[PDB]
Design a protein around this ligand. Structure first.
Ligand SMILES: O=C1c2cc3c(cc2O[C@@H]2CCCN12)OCCO3
Ligand SMILES: N[C@@H](Cn1oc(=O)[nH]c1=O)C(=O)O
Ligand SMILES: N[C@@H](Cn1oc(=O)[nH]c1=O)C(=O)O
Ligand SMILES: N[C@@H](Cn1oc(=O)[nH]c1=O)C(=O)O
Ligand SMILES: [Zn+2]
Ligand SMILES: [Zn+2]
Ligand SMILES: [Zn+2]
Ligand SMILES: [Zn+2]
Ligand SMILES: [Zn+2]
Lengths: 258, 258, 259
């Protein structure tokens, strides 16, 4: 059977090709995860169909209904057979879905408009002139919501009650907000997205300070999926062949615009 | 410009829409007070933003710190410009904030699990097999704390010393306690909430006896607010036009499940 | 030559966000009758353009107090846009402040009901109170009822202006959703063009009833004294005569039919 793959439109993982309007199916997309999906499918021996997650979210569980949304939800409720995207491996998710060994490393980081007087998370917490927030329904927001570390705990207290809201629906929204806020808004996002954007015109943003944590993205399948085993071994093979590093350079630094 | 409205997640006044995760701002909520807020804003000519009170409380002044919590606190300390919720008009509150004429009438009442051998407050006060309590923080608890009426004084003497605590953090907690206590717990709450729950599945609770008092909910604003006058006139207009009665029937009886 | 700023409004099937295009850029994000019309007008007039969605999401009305114009009309009046290409109704109060091309589409105010609603005309609505009814805010339909001297419409306005809760809605989508969730207790007054479009969209539970209450048209608008006015007007006439407008109507209304 054709494997239904759920993914998300997030640069440079999955993007619509310039002339996508004249293309069909998987050919409409390009990006790191588009290339990865092709490789994984080749090694695991399956045909597939790329589908963009319906609600455009990564995945979080509603505290009241306990219902999962995003790509995680699509796997949990059987709408998709596998998720190939920058989906962060976390404990709460590992409890409802399966993850392959990580194919990419990352950590939460800070994105600022060049010139912004901020060098670290500690800096953001000690002031209020510069607003800062995170993405919604993702692992970064959860990180702050559950952090016991003084600095991060203080930051969350601020963000959760900030008005207007400092949270954004998509990474694109967060980046645009930083670029138009004349340095009055800093965005907390994964180092991977941060470093990609830093190399794209108008080259007005930059990553500052060290990462807040160390984790990784994994290919996810529904609990007990028969694809889990093969997918995991495929990720290990691709990493050892140097293919993952090749794809990283291809989409991040190769063709950089700055 | 945009008026910050503080309210509380209390059914059927303000509730999260089933699909709130895919909606934004004021569209995330539904209920009697959500409908009323839109009308008050339309008639007073202002844009607004609904916000759920941070500590999930109605409002009481801490003995010692003298600090106000809940929605009252949000108004007193300037976090919100107006409160549109089932906020009871009381003397201690009228001393620090302004209230519009009442938009809904209510009285403290008794909620029992069907079959409970209780028909009045006097009944509760003359026995001990059936425990009873109130919302841990609110106008009801204060009613008993300050009452000089024998029956109620007797009830307060019992409740304030009962162990384990007979007080609850939210109305929902109280309702759940009544439903799971096999008739060994009765809950004292405002007639409005009582009558609402009476029409909700599993239809295992009911309001018994007459109300202990007679009062009302009012729209509150910070002392001296420029919004006070128009808001008051809007409440009077909406009541005279029959809107308030229409909204109560809509959220209490038209959608009754019993 | 400079890039012409086009103001329009998100109203189906005139201008709609293509599925999953929220994060893309430029005119490629949108599709619809007015998107296709803009392309043809620009081609015939020889100009480059940028589609922008009206900031306040309104068509355009003048506030009685401040006398300030909002919506697409306002964007033209205050110089925020160079032209409006949308389902903007040609009206006297508007033509007094902006210029309109000859109409590119005909329409009339009509009634939308949830299937099964016992209403067949405006007269019917006016002679009962069980079923509520209203219109869009800040638009030509509301103004039509506000100024009407016709017995039936005057009675309808008297009712709508003070009905509680408000019978008016912020967007066409809101009015449509209200009809659909009201179990026949709400009827929506809107332009026949939108009515006929929705009637062919799932869940296919609404329908237009009775004849139109008036007859008017949508026009492409430009600020007074705009150097684009003349060419745009002639372009509209050419598009009509070439059968292009009829082709676009069929493409977005009937060929798209889901019922
Ligand atoms: O998620 C990850 C991770 C992710 C990763 C690695 C190594 C990793 O090891 C770190 C330390 C513990 C958490 N980490 O190597 C390959 C790329 O992805
Ligand atoms: N990969 C994250 C999504 N997200 O991307 C960021 O940059 N922050 C954030 O929460 C996830 O899987 O939830
Ligand atoms: N409306 C009350 C809150 N509360 O709801 C009840 O049912 N009891 C009670 O104290 C208040 O404004 O304090
Ligand atoms: N085209 C109308 C807007 N509107 O759409 C309707 O269906 N009614 C209404 O007022 C306008 O230009 O004001
Ligand atoms: Zn496209
Ligand atoms: Zn390979
Ligand atoms: Zn929820
Ligand atoms: Zn042509
Ligand atoms: Zn009203």
């Amino acid at each position: 059977k054709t494997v239904v793959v759920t993914t998300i439109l997030e640069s440079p993982y999955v993007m619509m090709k310039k002339n996508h309007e004249m293309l069909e199916g998987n050919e409409r997309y390009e990006g790191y995860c588009v290339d990865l999906a092709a490789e994984i499918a080749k090694h695991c021996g399956f045909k597939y169909k790329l589908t963009i997650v319906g609600d455009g979210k990564y995945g979080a569980r509603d505290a009241d209904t306990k219902i999962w949304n995003g790509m995680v939800g699509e796997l949990v409720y059987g709408k998709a057979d596998i998720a190939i995207a920058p989906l962060t491996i976390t404990l709460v998710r590992e409890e409802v879905i399966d993850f392959s060994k990580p194919f990419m490393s990352l950590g939460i980081s800070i994105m600022i408009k060049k010139g912004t007087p901020i060098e670290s998370a500690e800096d953001l917490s000690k002031q209020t002139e510069i607003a800062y927030g995170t993405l919604d329904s993702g692992s970064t927001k959860e990180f702050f919501r559950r952090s016991k570390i003084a600095v991060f705990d203080k930051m969350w207290t601020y963000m959760r009650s900030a008005e207007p809201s400092v949270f954004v629906r998509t990474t694109a929204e967060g980046v645009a907000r930083v670029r138009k806020s004349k340095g009055k808004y800093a965005y907390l996002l994964e180092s991977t997205m941060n470093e990609y954007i830093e190399q794209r015109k108008p080259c007005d943003t930059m990553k500052v300070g060290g990462n807040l944590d160390s984790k990784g993205y994994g290919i996810a399948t529904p609990k007990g999926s028969s694809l889990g085993n093969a997918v995991n071994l495929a990720v290990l093979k691709l990493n050892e062949q140097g293919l993952l590093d090749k794809l990283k350079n291809k989409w991040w630094y190769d063709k950089g615009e700055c």
